[PDB]
């Protein structure tokens, strides 16, 4: 019945959580911000078995509870760490070479400041104030206006614009690449028909000079998709060598057009077409193709979607249908139980 549902809450929250709590710490020891998550989640998960929250069917926990101190600590840590991660990602997207410039002991001080930032509203709110601890809706003096504003409005707004600018900057980078390649593609195609309709060496040399200049420029520019790999990666060397032969075919076609004969220049330019479409065009056909490489978006989305409903029933009642009590622990326990699987899923 009610006791059975409450009894299994502590076992599900602790045993599942503590299994990944030590594992996350061990894995991190063997991602400075994630080290805080493995640490912060472990503190209020270790003290959860002390009071299994099953003393409601023992009149215990007179000067202790999992609610006030531990949930305030957890919410503050999660919000501060999510804001820090979002700000770091936004800075990295928006040229972090000025804000940080790879200056991540400086990040250790900020990492340890999450508890310091937590120790201004989470632990500082250590008081009963008619909380659970074993008229309105708990709003006589504990209306949690600050808890809702800092817990929800501060974290959601900071995170929401942070990835919005991250995806916006990513689109502008990619956009600045497809247009340049398309421009270089357009001049290669446009100048090729003039050569195929050439009448004298006066123009077939001029057309090739423009096409050589475009190929050299396009080689420096990164491809639209299949990008972000290391410059010395075989695929990047495979792409770069694809233009070291295209220009080589330009030099051979232009050198034979410098002597004076032009009937041969089209044939050399023609054989440039058959190799430019078979390999270069196929490369860009699969190119011009979103989500971060990690599960940081997943953990942030899950937390804000499970703890916002926790505070939704906090002030929902106004001065009956009080179903937010049994689901109170379950909603938060799921997030703690979702912490190690998300970390495992991120590692894959």
């Amino acid at each position, epitope marked *: 019945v009610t006791r059975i549902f409450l009894v299994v809450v502590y076992s599900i929250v602790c045993f599942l959580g503590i299994l990944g709590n030590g594992l996350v710490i061990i894995i991190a020891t063997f991602m400075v911000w994630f080290l805080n998550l493995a640490v912060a989640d472990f503190l209020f998960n270790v003290f959860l078995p002390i009071h299994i929250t099953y003393a409601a069917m023992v009149f215990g926990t007179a000067m202790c509870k999992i609610s006030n101190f531990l949930l305030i600590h957890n919410m503050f840590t999660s919000v501060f760490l999510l804001t820090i991660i979002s700000s770091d990602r936004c800075i990295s997207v928006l040229l972090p070479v000025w804000s940080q410039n790879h200056r991540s002991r400086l990040a250790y001080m900020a990492c340890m400041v999450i508890w310091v930032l937590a120790f201004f509203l989470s632990s500082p709110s250590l008081v009963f104030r008619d909380t659970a601890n074993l008229v309105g809706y708990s709003r006589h003096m504990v209306v949690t206006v600050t808890r809702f504003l800092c817990g929800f409005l501060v974290p959601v707004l900071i995170i929401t614009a942070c990835y919005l600018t991250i995806v916006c900057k990513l689109q502008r980078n990619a956009r600045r690449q497809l247009a340049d390649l398309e421009d270089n593609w357009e001049t290669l195609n446009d100048n090729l028909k003039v050569i195929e309709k050439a009448d004298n060496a006066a123009q077939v040399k001029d057309a090739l000079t423009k096409m*050589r200049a475009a190929a*050299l420029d396009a080689q*420096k520019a990164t491809p639209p998709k299949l990008e972000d790999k290391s410059p010395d990666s075989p695929e990047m060397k495979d792409f770069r060598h694809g233009f070291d032969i295209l220009v080589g075919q330009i030099d051979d076609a232009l050198k034979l057009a410098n002597e004076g004969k032009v009937k041969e220049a089209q044939a050399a330019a023609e054989q440039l077409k058959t190799t430019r479409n078979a390999y270069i065009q196929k490369y860009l056909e699969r190119a011009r193709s979103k989500k971060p490489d990690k599960i940081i978006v997943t953990i942030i989305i899950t937390f804000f979607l499970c703890w916002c409903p926790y505070h939704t029933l906090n002030l929902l009642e106004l001065h009956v249908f009080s179903l937010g009590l049994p689901l109170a622990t379950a909603l938060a326990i799921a997030n703690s139980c979702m912490n190690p699987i998300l970390y495992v899923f991120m590692g894959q």
Partner: antibody
Amino acid sequence: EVQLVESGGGLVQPGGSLRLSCAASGFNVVDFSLHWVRQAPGKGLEWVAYISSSSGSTSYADSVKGRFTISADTSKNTAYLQMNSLRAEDTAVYYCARWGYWPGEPWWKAFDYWGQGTLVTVSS
Amino acid sequence: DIQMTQSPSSLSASVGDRVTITCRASQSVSSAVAWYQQKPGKAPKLLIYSASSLYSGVPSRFSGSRSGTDFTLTISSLQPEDFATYYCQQYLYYSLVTFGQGTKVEIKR
């Protein structure tokens, strides 16, 4: 090391012939092309002609096309520049430059190991 | 076949000053220009190649940028030894090399 030597520069009657020998020890003429750049006294540098002894693709400047006749011999590591029907406006200091081969780094480096350059003057 | 221009053809900077020299290529030319420093009565020496790199052996004070079809060379400091004529040269093919008019640097007084 790379070292270029020129010779054959001196007084020339207008309409005469001259021969400048771009001796280049160190590297090999086969490895790198040899461009001839001339600088009229009191003016900027001007390109004249180039030779690539690996295959042979001589192509002179527009103003000196046909009159000059550039050549290169790997057996002597030289790049001669035959002068024909020399005029009074061709007086300058003729440098002998070097240049790499596509692809790779050597092409992207422009004329780097210039020779000393021997002046040629034309007067009546 | 292309025309290469340098508006600042006579500079009167002093010791320790910074000199910016602009170079504009008429046709579409990729990052394929170079800058030579010709001391009087001597052969020119390469300073900057590919419009961004630095030659092996040049002092770090010489740097260049591209910023579009134009090109620029910036000198951080002007030592007394560094006072000569600087030429802007492009190179797209072997037969399409065109040199700039030339920038001369003198002593301010």
